[PDB]
Design a protein around this nucleic acid. Structure first.
Ligand SMILES: [Mg+2]
Ligand SMILES: [Mg+2]
Ligand SMILES: [Mg+2]
Ligand SMILES: [Mg+2]
Ligand SMILES: [Mg+2]
Ligand SMILES: [Mg+2]
Ligand SMILES: [Mg+2]
Ligand SMILES: [Zn+2]
Lengths: 141, 204, 81, 96, 60, 126
RNA sequence: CGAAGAACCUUACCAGGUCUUGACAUCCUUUGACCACUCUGGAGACAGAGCUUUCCCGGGACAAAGUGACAGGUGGUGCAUGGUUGUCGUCAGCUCGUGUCGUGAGAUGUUGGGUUAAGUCCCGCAACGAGCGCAACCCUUGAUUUUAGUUGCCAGCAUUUAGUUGGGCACUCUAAAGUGACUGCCGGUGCAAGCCGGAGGAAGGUGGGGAUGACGUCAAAUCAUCAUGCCCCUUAUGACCUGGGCUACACACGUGCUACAAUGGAUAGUACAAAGGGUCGCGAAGCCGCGAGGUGGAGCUAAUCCCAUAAAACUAUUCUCAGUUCGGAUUGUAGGCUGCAACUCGCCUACAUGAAGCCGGAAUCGCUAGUAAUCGUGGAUCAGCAUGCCACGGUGAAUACG
């Protein structure tokens, strides 16, 4: 991988690659650029700072693994790898940004990063729910 | 498993194809002409130990080189055998013909010749152990660095068939720096057909 | 033929049908032709068309001009399993 | 102002035949170009390895051509004669 | 069959559309390559044997 | 006129450098009329910013083969080559930036029995 | 999947109409050009007539009729066979000579400790060695030198609508011979093999990808590619012709193509590919036609010319999230090609119709990198008939804790 041409972040390039569909890097990259332009419009501040806050909010710590224990299969919690951490953040971001149901993709993504920096959205509900099930099953650690 | 034809694996690598010419609009015609030619040669010179045939084309002439162990039958006491050949080959080709005849030394270093030996033996009801083994010893005396044979069929008149293979010497088929010769010949029996396969690993 | 360069009809059928103007339609014409068009000149005279095993009669009309003869003589006999 | 095109299946035969022509052509007239290589136009025939079944397992056969081109720049009747007499290792095709 | 069919191939048909290719060695109609005029399996045989000019085994 | 060749996939860029202000032609066209994307244009810049030589030379390019990104990769490659040519002391910078690594990722064969290079059909036991 | 092309032919099957030394070969006897084209009865095979058969120098080659020997069978058995093939599995294993232990069958070797992609390689051992395999030799890709510069290239140059024309091989490109990458070098550890890191270099760890498939297993498949033993039919299980069927249709499975849409569709403009094919074949420009195509005939036996606008991408405008300008079936009418012929039963076009489908149950499949996904292109077969097959490049990811 490599950092983005414009911003000094590999996260942007990864998010582009994870929104990309059938090699359409141009479309993906352009819409993410315009989506940061939208969040700069409606916020006026650092797109990197707001995207970082959204990351830090959607970013899980604990996650379940499915393990055979005692003649069945259980959910045991485990501290997630630092790479899978970001991977799951970006994955969840893109998937809720698709299933949302607004007009345009850049719009969906921009609203989700806003909500995420604000500690709202399906993507944060996901982190909370993962913590909730792992904590329910923390007996097995 | 299944083996690749160790000649075909080595065409364009260390062996030149025997049917040598260039052609366009004339290709199929020349090909099937030369297949008819090889049918003629194999038909009327199987007895003569014919073992290789290279074809050449230029100026409309049908140039040929027959590598044989006994020239004394393809030519010899008459001097009219090769003339008969080029006459009938003129009748077929509708062209001119010329035929060189090369003497093979160490005739037991050609898998085709060895396979015809073994096949004629097995038609004369010789033991398929003695046949393979005597051919092997003749090769390794003639100068083969390696030899291998096998027979498959109704060996000895059985109902169920199998294969019997025997090898002396180094016979690496995966190496391509190998100069290997290969051959497959068929023998007839009152029970059915026997397949003889041979291949030789040679000096340099 | 699909093209303005046509139509098509078998000569061995056109000739017999033209001779069949004095037929009076008491007789019938057999053909192994299913590929030949129907002209209006075929009208009235029943044709017995060879489906593969038998000659099946068809009565020509103004309405079945423009089509072929085989459309009125099926090949595959099928009864709803 | 005359041209030779040599095309065959064997680049060693073809190169050496061209070198033969070029040396003889320089002997019979000094001013001649060198041989120039053209692209190797080829044909890959793809065949069922098996007889009956097994569409999935195959064997591939490449028929290449190698070919060189020569341009004579000052002919003489000596050159034309040296090329009119000369027969090459067959398996090739000469074109003038 | 196949001998009568190989005969009927070679004589000229009623209409020229009725042509069709057959390997002269073994008159199978399928997978006969008009550039060689051979069927695929005979072609593989002879190509192994080196009785076809210029063809070898395609590595790449 | 400094010179370099550059290859990426099936793209071939014969590229040359002169001393100038920073103007760039590609196939007798504007770099912006040929590569409109900021991403690919920055990709072209990458050697000239890894070693601070952007505001010094003009990049003059001709290209054939491949697509737009491949041509871009070829161009940056030949550029880094010509930077070596004008100054071997740019070798360490451009090597450690990885621009001299001729991208050997070529497009892989299709094979028989496979619907691509590696893809196989959908397996079924029954 | 055989099928790299089921309209007739193919085609082996069916119905009908016909022939029996035959549709196809040798041997005998007579003769010699045999035939070709027209007419009539025909669905045609085939019958009647005509015109008209020039054999060439006893020989040669092919031919009509007699005549029996023989022919012919896509008739059988892949549990008699060859050869060809998958398959475990490109898994790393299978064996053998001599020696030794064991009454013996058997073992040893080939186990062990390490290591490796690998019975790869080292240390050890009653084994020492070898063969098949592994690896490597081969092709291709990845950088570069010399040779040669047209049909390719165009920098320094002028000039053309055009790299055009002149000129020159600089650079590409082409393709022959070379170079290089070999743990070869350095640091760490190991006893050692080796392992990890580092450097240089284009490439670092069998660089990437191919072909390359050991003894043998499934009495795996193939008598329908071919040959082939035995058996069977041999005025018919053989042969010709027409027409039909292999394309059926209550229903089940597999494999794929198309979609179910806004990372999109309609419309316009518009940039960048590779690998390939072409002689009676590619077929240009220009023109007519909404279009499929027609006309035309340039150039080309091809790095020259054509097939051949590459499409996705990008830019603009519109549609505004809807069973919709989605989707494109199905059907009606009218066209175009191909071919003697497009009903059964081809493909393509125009107009209209506008189906189902608003992301798929239980389950289940491919993929570790220029790969998956996605977009077009070409080739074969082929008159025409592809969502199939094999190759091509374009764009280009996610992830691997274990
Ligand atoms: Mg046909
Ligand atoms: Mg079997
Ligand atoms: Mg069977
Ligand atoms: Mg190997
Ligand atoms: Mg069986
Ligand atoms: Mg079928
Ligand atoms: Mg792993
Ligand atoms: Zn054949």
């Amino acid at each position: 991988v490599l950092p983005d041409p414009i911003y000094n972040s590999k996260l942007v390039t990864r998010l582009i690659n994870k929104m990309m569909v059938d090699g359409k890097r141009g479309k993906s990259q352009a819409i993410l650029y315009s989506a940061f332009d939208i969040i700069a419009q409606e916020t006026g501040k650092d797109p990197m700072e707001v995207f970082e806050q959204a990351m830090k909010n959607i970013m899980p710590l604990l996650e379940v693994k499915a393990r055979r224990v005692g003649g069945a299969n259980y959910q045991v919690p485990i501290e997630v790898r630092a790479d899978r951490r970001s991977t799951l953040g970006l994955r969840w971001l893109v998937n809720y940004a698709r299933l949302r149901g607004e007009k345009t993709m850049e719009v969906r993504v921009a609203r989700e990063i806003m909500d995420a920096a604000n500690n709202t959205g399906a993507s944060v509900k996901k982190r909370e729910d993962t913590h909730k099930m792992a904590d329910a099953n923390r007996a097995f650690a | 498993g299944q083996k690749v034809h160790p000649i075909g694996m080595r065409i364009g690598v260390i062996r030149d194809w025997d049917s040598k010419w260039y052609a366009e609009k004339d290709y199929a015609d020349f090909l099937h002409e030369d297949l008819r030619i090889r049918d003629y040669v194999a038909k009327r010179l199987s007895d003569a130990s014919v073992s290789r045939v290279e074809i050449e084309r230029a100026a409309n002439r049908v140039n040929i080189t027959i590598h044989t162990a006994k020239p004394g039958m393809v030519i010899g006491k008459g001097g009219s055998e090769v003339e008969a050949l080029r006459k009938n080959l003129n009748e077929l080709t509708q062209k001119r013909v010329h035929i060189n005849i090369v003497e093979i030394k160490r005739a037991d270093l050609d898998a085709k010749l060895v396979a015809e030996n073994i096949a004629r033996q097995l038609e004369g009801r010789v033991s398929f152990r003695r046949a393979q083994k005597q051919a092997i010893q003749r090769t390794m005396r003639a100068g083969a660095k390696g030899i291998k044979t096998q027979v498959s069929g109704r060996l000895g008149g059985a109902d169920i068939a199998r294969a019997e293979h025997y090898s002396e010497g180094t016979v690496p088929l995966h190496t391509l720096r190998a100069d290997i010769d290969y051959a497959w010949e068929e023998a007839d029996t009152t029970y059915g057909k026997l397949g003889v396969k041979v291949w030789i690993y040679r000096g340099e | 033929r699909s093209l303005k360069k046509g139509p098509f009809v078998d000569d061995h059928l056109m000739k017999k049908v033209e001779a069949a103007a004095e037929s009076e339609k008491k007789q019938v014409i057999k053909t192994w032709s299913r590929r030949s068009t129907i002209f209006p000149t075929f009208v009235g005279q029943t044709i017995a068309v060879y489906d593969g095993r038998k000659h099946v009669p068809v009565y020509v009309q103004e309405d079945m001009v423009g089509h072929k003869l085989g459309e009125f003589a099926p090949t595959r006999t099928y009864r709803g399993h | 102002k005359i041209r030779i095109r040599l095309k065959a299946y064997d680049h060693r035969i073809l190169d050496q035949s061209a070198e033969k022509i070029v040396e003889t052509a320089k002997r019979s007239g000094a001013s001649v170009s060198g041989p120039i290589p053209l692209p190797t136009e080829k044909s890959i025939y793809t065949v069922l390895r098996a007889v009956h079944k097994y569409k999935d397992s195959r064997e591939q056969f490449e028929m290449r051509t190698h070919k060189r081109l020569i341009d004579i720049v000052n002919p003489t009747p000596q050159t034309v004669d040296s090329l009119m007499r000369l027969d090459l290792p067959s398996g090739v095709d000469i074109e003038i | 069959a196949k001998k009568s069919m190989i005969a009927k191939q070679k004589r000229t048909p009623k209409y020229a559309v009725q042509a069709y290719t057959r390997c002269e060695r073994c008159g199978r109609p399928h997978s006969v390559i008009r550039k060689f005029k051979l069927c695929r399996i005979c072609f593989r045989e002879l190509a192994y044997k080196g009785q076809i000019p210029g063809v070898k085994k395609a590595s790449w | 006129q400094y010179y370099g060749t550059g290859r990426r996939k099936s793209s071939v860029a014969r590229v040359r450098l002169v001393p100038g202000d920073g103007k760039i032609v590609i196939n007798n066209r504007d770099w912006e009329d040929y590569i409109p994307f900021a991403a690919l244009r920055e990709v072209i810049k990458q050697p000239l910013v890894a070693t601070e030589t952007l505001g010094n030379y003009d990049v003059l390019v001709n290209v054939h083969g491949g697509g737009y990104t491949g041509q871009a990769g070829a161009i940056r490659h030949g550029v880094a080559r010509a930077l070596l040519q004008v100054a071997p002391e740019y070798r360490p910078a451009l090597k450690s930036a990885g621009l001299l690594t001729r991208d050997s990722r070529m497009k892989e064969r299709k094979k028989p029995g496979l619907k691509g290079a590696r893809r196989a059909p959908q397996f079924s036991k029954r």
